[PDB]
Write a protein that binds this ligand. Structure first.
Ligand SMILES: CNC(=O)[C@@H](NC(=O)[C@H](CC(C)C)CN(O)C=O)C(C)(C)C
Ligand SMILES: [Ca+2]
Ligand SMILES: [Ca+2]
Ligand SMILES: [Ca+2]
Ligand SMILES: [Ca+2]
Ligand SMILES: [Ca+2]
Ligand SMILES: [Zn+2]
Ligand SMILES: [Zn+2]
Length: 159
């Protein structure tokens, strides 16, 4: 799930294929939209929601075996995974629906913060070594602006 390719276009599209059962669809749509806004705010990239398989970034929730060759591991552990820029499954983001999805403080994992991380990968970013960076390989809930200077540098270096 590591590559050295970026998107050659800036008007990126995404399709929310299916939903998690833990949150209302209006809440999920908004969380994803706000996750994309974080990135489009520090780059010339834009994100448009479409409803066909033609989108660049296809989003889906799955449990265990779900299509590709990297099944999820049930409760906890791996929360999700995304693929680097490119055609087909490339650039897609998958979330493990065996996890309890929520938002803000409290039990469960923030769909908003995890989405922002996955979309980072979907745009070409690799993991960061800075603990407070959003791209750090470990989940950590936080309030306030999610993107660290390190995350902003990495994304602007590509676009
Ligand atoms: C609570 N569990 C964890 O913190 C696990 N980490 C993850 O599931 C990463 C995503 C979080 C950072 C949103 C996977 N990743 O890199 C996706 O692109 C483990 C550190 C246990 C692997
Ligand atoms: Ca902008
Ligand atoms: Ca794709
Ligand atoms: Ca899991
Ligand atoms: Ca769930
Ligand atoms: Ca919560
Ligand atoms: Zn997958
Ligand atoms: Zn990651």
């Amino acid at each position: 799930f590591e590559g050295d390719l970026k998107w050659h276009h800036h008007n990126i599209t995404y399709w929310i294929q299916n939903y998690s059962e833990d949150l209302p669809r209006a809440v999920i749509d908004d969380a994803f939209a706000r996750a994309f806004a974080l990135w489009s705010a520090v780059t010339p990239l834009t994100f448009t929601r479409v409803y066909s398989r033609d989108a660049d970034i296809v989003i889906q929730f799955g449990v265990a075996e779900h299509g590709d060759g990297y099944p999820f591991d049930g409760k906890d552990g791996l929360l999700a995974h995304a693929f680097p820029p490119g055609p087909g499954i490339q650039g897609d983001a998958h979330f493990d629906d065996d996890e309890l999805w929520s938002l803000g403080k409290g039990q469960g994992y923030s769909l908003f913060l995890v989405a922002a991380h996955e979309f980072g990968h979907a745009l070409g970013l690799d993991h960061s070594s800075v603990p407070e960076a959003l791209m750090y390989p470990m989940y950590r809930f936080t309030e306030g602006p999610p993107l660290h200077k390190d995350d902003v540098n990495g994304i602007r270096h590509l676009y």
